[PDB]
Amino acid sequence: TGYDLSASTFSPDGRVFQVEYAMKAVENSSTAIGIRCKDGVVFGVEKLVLSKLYEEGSNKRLFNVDRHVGMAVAGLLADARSLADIAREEASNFRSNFGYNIPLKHLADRVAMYVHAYTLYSAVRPFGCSFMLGSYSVNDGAQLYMIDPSGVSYGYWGCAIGKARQAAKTEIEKLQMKEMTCRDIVKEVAKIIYIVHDEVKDKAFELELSWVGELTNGRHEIVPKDIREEAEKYAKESLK
Amino acid sequence: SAGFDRHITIFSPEGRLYQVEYAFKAINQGGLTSVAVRGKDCAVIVTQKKVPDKLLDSSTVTHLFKITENIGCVMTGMTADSRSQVQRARYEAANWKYKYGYEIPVDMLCKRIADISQVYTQNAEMRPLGCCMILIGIDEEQGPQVYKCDPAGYYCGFKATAAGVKQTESTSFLEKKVKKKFDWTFEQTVETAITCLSTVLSIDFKPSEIEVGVVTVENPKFRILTEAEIDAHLVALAE
Amino acid sequence: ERGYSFSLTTFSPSGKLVQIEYALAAVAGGAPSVGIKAANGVVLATEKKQKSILYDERSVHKVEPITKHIGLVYSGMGPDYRVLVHRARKLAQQYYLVYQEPIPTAQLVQRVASVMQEYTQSGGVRPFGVSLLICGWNEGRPYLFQSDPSGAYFAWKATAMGKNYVNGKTFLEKRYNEDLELEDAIHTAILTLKESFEGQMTEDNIEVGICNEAGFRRLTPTEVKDYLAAIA
Amino acid sequence: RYDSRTTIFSPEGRLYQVEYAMEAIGHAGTCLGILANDGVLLAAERRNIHKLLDEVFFSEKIYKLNEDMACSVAGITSDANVLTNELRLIAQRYLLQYQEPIPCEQLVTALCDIKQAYTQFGGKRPFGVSLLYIGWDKHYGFQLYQSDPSGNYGGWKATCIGNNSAAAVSMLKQDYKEGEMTLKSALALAIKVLNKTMDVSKLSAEKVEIATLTRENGKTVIRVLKQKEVEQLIKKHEEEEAKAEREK
Amino acid sequence: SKMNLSEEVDLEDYVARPDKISGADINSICQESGMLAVRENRYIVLAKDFEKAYKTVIKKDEQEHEFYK
């Protein structure tokens, strides 16, 4: 109280409260997980359908930053879409000024610095969305970076963001992502998403998958339905 | 007295800037501690590498950021602000090299960084970067140099220094240590840094949790010690 | 009148720009600094105490040169002193470029004070929490001025700023004579700092610099050592 | 309250910040000027008379603006410097544009316009400096001009600004003979007024500056009285006071 | 006077120091000297513990955040 009204005021104990509040906004959203294969990165988010009138794909949280980069936002969807636009702009500028695809580490660092710049001023508020970036290229392998409203971003072997972050993390540790390929790990991602779902507080959800790896020739695209359905079947095979 | 701590540009009745002090207190939020020691011909920095999760990529959690080949840094404090400050430092070093030819000395480098921090703390436009910057680098005619320089914009040269949650105890240990004149050798410098951090932390210092970077007169290039050299230094330290 | 002690662009009902006095109080809580003008030169002396032996004493110098014949000593906040010395150097170089003559000390002080005043006229910019003490040797006569965050500048013959400045001022007007010379001025600065100094005054703990006709130069630790040994 | 910023109007229609700035002027040292038939002068009091303070400029309170203008200063030192620098700038700009000296009132009007703009636009505090002006011009000759922090000026024959202004002005109005004052009589009156305007007795010469404006052979020489003539005036006033008490 | 003290301690060594410390500081110095002597199971107060107590009490700056000075 008193020190939490603006993003530029330090608390007496020394913590920017607005950033923590924006974090709490992210924690209020649904779970989005990304698992790095031995040979790629797979994205899966739990997209709740708020009303049945929607169009089985409206306001999707899976965004294509570039040909090889994918984003799996979780949080305030307007801020997430704006951040996806900023990431696309950064990737396009990097490609235009340097001639080659932006490395995932550099893109994550730049988008994080853009995010962190919004926790520095009183006239702007920190972003209310947390997003994870994934890409694959034979030159530098598979990378997966998660960026939260603070602007901090390090690579992850496997990360979750949203309400059931903790449960998704407990389940994802018992997976040996170091050696598995991006084929069965998609079924695993579907199974974890189905485990992390309340189903009595959240009425329904539409599972959407995404990946980038060797089997997608280094590009990021929507997971094909002809194997997304089998991932869903494996998820149903698990009782929860 | 307590009403003057909401804007950085407002002076306390006793003549203090409370927002700057709060930013200083924000440095300890990371829960990490970094210590830097200057030898006769080398400068060694070590810092905690906390990975409280098996799924983190330990390669990307490193707090040692290389400003240039002959200038290195360790950043303690809030992560995002520290990363912004290192990007600014790299830009400043590159601009100095482009504008004057010769590489920027370490003191001048984060003296410019501290000038940026000070202009931040004077004009109330952005919050000061809650991150302490510790610089190293071999400089000609002056030997090794390590300068710690802070959000307030205060920069100084140190024979040894440290910043983080466990700052005062580590500085007291170094005071007890840097009073006995002895050959400050590479081995001895790394050993004394590791002893400082271990004793202040009261931790056995498994090699996976400490990350070390050193610049030497013989090799004036910032080099980050990998697992093998860190373990060798620890075992040489124990015996 | 606690309601008017926040903004810099408002007048108190009594008519006091409260933030200026607050910055002055911040200045007076700074490190001691004393400067004396002798018949042949000017002496600037500040104490430079680190919290530990862990600090390189020679890395940061409280006494800095502006031109070949202008010095700077401060009492207050060092980070503000750095921007102040940078601005003073730029103003001196601009004057030199325009007029092809080393900038007069009075003119340098006036321009520096105008820079200091520039931060005391708008909300959102903090007054410089540091007061400068400026030496100089112009037209064959020594100069000594003090510039405040208020923007006011005067022509102190001899003064002490910072912590325990009252004691330093009381020592002055007692051991200060208008017809002294450079060595006596150095000695007077040494004793003036001494009674405002806690602990032993080492060659690293006190930084001095004379500002005579030969120009301003920061005395090396050897000269401070021999001067202190003569005093001690 | 209605004094949060200068742009706020009180319900009665009073700029409280402006009134605060004017009431603050009394904190400044005493400054006064007397208009005589053959010239005009200014008198100032040095509040800071510390023996450790060197006097190098000899014009800390009275500033020369143009070859035929001068001004006394009372108020905030930084604002004082800013206003005098702007005064010199306006004077030289008018000289460059018209190639004739400023008719005094124009320069005063320029300062008053700047000050009014400062008290009108938001984000700027009023200039807490009230300054007297002296000068000679081809249209009306010797003039004494007064400036307030609000930018309201006015022609005057003799005023006082600073400490104990009201008493000095009242005694000026009591014992000023219109159209019968010479520069010597004006100096004597200024010394008499400054004697008991300030609480300090004996009227030390080191604590008082006087500058006089004269019209000699069309040159308009601005003279600041040195310590010798000031001390001579002090002794003259002392002997006059001794003669006055002889009747007692 | 009431303390046991020792022959080797010379209070004039501590008095002549330029540090400006109040009478409360003197009392604190002496009490810390007694505590240091008692901690080492010694009933006599010597130069070393008195010096260490002096140094401890003299240290009053604490943080000061390094830029106010």
UniProtKB/Swiss-Prot annotation, chain B:
Component of the 20S core proteasome complex involved in the proteolytic degradation of most intracellular proteins. This complex plays numerous essential roles within the cell by associating with different regulatory particles. Associated with two 19S regulatory particles, forms the 26S proteasome and thus participates in the ATP-dependent degradation of ubiquitinated proteins. This is Proteasome subunit alpha type-6. The modification N6-acetyllysine is found at K97, K99. InterPro entries: Ntn_hydrolases_N (IPR029055), Proteasome_alpha (IPR050115), Proteasome_alpha-type (IPR023332), Proteasome_asu_N (IPR000426), Proteasome_sua/b (IPR001353), Proteasome_subunit_alpha6 (IPR034642). The modification Phosphoserine is found at S12, S58, S59. The keyword Ribonucleoprotein does not apply. The 26S proteasome consists of a 20S proteasome core and two 19S regulatory subunits. The 20S proteasome core is a barrel-shaped complex made of 28 subunits that are arranged in four stacked rings. The two outer rings are each formed by seven alpha subunits, and the two inner rings are formed by seven beta subunits. The proteolytic activity is exerted by three beta-subunits PSMB5, PSMB6 and PSMB7. Interacts with ALKBH4. It is found in: Cytoplasm; Nucleus. The keyword Translocase does not apply. Keywords: Acetylation, Cytoplasm, Glycoprotein, Nucleus, Phosphoprotein, Proteasome. SUPFAM superfamilies: N-terminal nucleophile aminohydrolases (Ntn hydrolases). It comes from Homo sapiens (Human). PANTHER family: PROTEASOME SUBUNIT ALPHA/BETA.
From Swiss-Prot, chain C:
The modification Phosphoserine is found at S5, S12, S14. Phosphorylated on tyrosine residues; which may be important for nuclear import. Disulfide bonds: none annotated. Induction: Down-regulated by antioxidants BO-653 and probucol. Down-regulated in response to enterovirus 71 (EV71) infection (at protein level). Keywords: Acetylation, Cytoplasm, Nucleus, Phosphoprotein, Proteasome. The keyword Acetylation applies. One of its GO terms (biological process) is response to virus. The modification N6-acetyllysine is found at K68, K169. One of its GO terms (cellular component) is nucleoplasm. The modification Phosphotyrosine is found at Y4, Y22, Y74, Y119. Pfam families: Proteasome, Proteasome_A_N. It is found in: Cytoplasm; Nucleus. Component of the 20S core proteasome complex involved in the proteolytic degradation of most intracellular proteins. This complex plays numerous essential roles within the cell by associating with different regulatory particles. Associated with two 19S regulatory particles, forms the 26S proteasome and thus participates in the ATP-dependent degradation of ubiquitinated proteins. PANTHER family: PROTEASOME SUBUNIT ALPHA/BETA. The 26S proteasome consists of a 20S proteasome core and two 19S regulatory subunits. The 20S proteasome core is a barrel-shaped complex made of 28 subunits that are arranged in four stacked rings. The two outer rings are each formed by seven alpha subunits, and the two inner rings are formed by seven beta subunits. The proteolytic activity is exerted by three beta-subunits PSMB5, PSMB6 and PSMB7. Belongs to the peptidase T1A family.
Curated annotation (Swiss-Prot), chain D:
The keyword Metal-binding does not apply. Component of the 20S core proteasome complex involved in the proteolytic degradation of most intracellular proteins. This complex plays numerous essential roles within the cell by associating with different regulatory particles. Associated with two 19S regulatory particles, forms the 26S proteasome and thus participates in the ATP-dependent degradation of ubiquitinated proteins. Transmembrane segments: none annotated. InterPro entries: Ntn_hydrolases_N, Proteasome_alpha, Proteasome_alpha-type, Proteasome_asu_N, Proteasome_bsu_CS, Proteasome_sua/b. It holds the Pfam family Proteasome. CDD domains: proteasome_alpha_type_4 (cd03752). It comes from Homo sapiens. The keyword Cytoplasm applies. The modification Phosphoserine is found at S10, S72, S170. One of its GO terms (cellular component) is cytosol. The 26S proteasome consists of a 20S proteasome core and two 19S regulatory subunits. The 20S proteasome core is a barrel-shaped complex made of 28 subunits that are arranged in four stacked rings. The two outer rings are each formed by seven alpha subunits, and the two inner rings are formed by seven beta subunits. The proteolytic activity is exerted by three beta-subunits PSMB5, PSMB6 and PSMB7. Induction: Down-regulated by antioxidants BO-653 and probucol. Belongs to the peptidase T1A family. It is found in: Cytoplasm; Nucleus. Keywords: Acetylation, Cytoplasm, Host-virus interaction, Nucleus, Phosphoprotein, Proteasome. This is Proteasome subunit alpha type-4. The lineage of its organism: Eukaryota, Metazoa, Chordata, Craniata, Vertebrata.
Curated annotation (Swiss-Prot), chain E:
It is found in: Cytoplasm; Nucleus. The modification N6-acetyllysine is found at K48, K52. Component of the 26S proteasome, a multiprotein complex involved in the ATP-dependent degradation of ubiquitinated proteins. This complex plays a key role in the maintenance of protein homeostasis by removing misfolded or damaged proteins, which could impair cellular functions, and by removing proteins whose functions are no longer required. Therefore, the proteasome participates in numerous cellular processes, including cell cycle progression, apoptosis, or DNA damage repair. Component of the 19S proteasome regulatory particle complex. The 26S proteasome consists of a 20S core particle (CP) and two 19S regulatory subunits (RP). The regulatory particle is made of a lid composed of 9 subunits, a base containing 6 ATPases including PSMC4 and few additional components. Interacts with NR1I3. Interacts with PAAF1. Interacts with TRIM5. Interacts with ZFAND1. Belongs to the AAA ATPase family. This is 26S proteasome regulatory subunit 6B. It comes from Homo sapiens. The lineage of its organism: Eukaryota, Metazoa, Chordata, Craniata, Vertebrata.
